[PDB]
Design a protein around this ligand. Structure first.
Ligand SMILES: Cc1cc(C(C)(C)C)c(O)c(C(C)(C)C)c1
Length: 133
């Protein structure tokens, strides 16, 4: 059910990422470099385990998880969070919890593109990824 998310994806558009990062308390210098970074996201499965890599010139992250099972995560901005990823309405929904705060990272396939919507507080960022051959 996750299979159409799998593969290598490149960022092609971003809206409001600075607002999202600022809401999370990311410092201005980190925001500045992130506003110009074009990450590559790689999503692979092996049985019930998904691995999601985010690679860039700036920061790199990797998580592995089973859908519907909580995992500890250290985010790119060094937040220590409790995470869970679920499929909901065909969307891959990643919820992070820390210090009573929440943020959602929601991925949806629209016309073969991967739309990532990042919400924290009132900030809503939309990032568009396109598949690599
Ligand atoms: C500063 C910064 C913050 C984030 C989140 C806040 C989405 C975790 C992030 O994912 C990245 C890369 C996409 C560059 C890894 C950089």
């Amino acid at each position: 059910m996750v299979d159409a998310f799998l593969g290598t994806w490149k960022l092609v558009d971003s809206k409001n990422f600075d607002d999202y990062m600022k809401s999370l308390g990311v410092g201005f210098a980190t925001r500045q470099v992130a506003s110009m970074t074009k990450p590559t996201t790689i999503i692979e499965k092996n049985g019930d385990i998904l691995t999601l890599k985010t690679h860039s010139t700036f920061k790199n992250t990797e998580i592995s998880f089973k859908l519907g099972v909580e995992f500890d995560e250290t985010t790119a901005d060094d937040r220590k969070v409790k995470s869970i990823v679920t499929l909901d309405g065909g969307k891959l929904v990643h919820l992070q919890k820390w210090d009573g705060q929440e943020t959602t990272l929601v991925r949806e396939l629209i016309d073969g593109k991967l739309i990532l919507t990042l919400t924290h507080g009132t900030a809503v960022c939309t990032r568009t990824y396109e598949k690599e051959a």
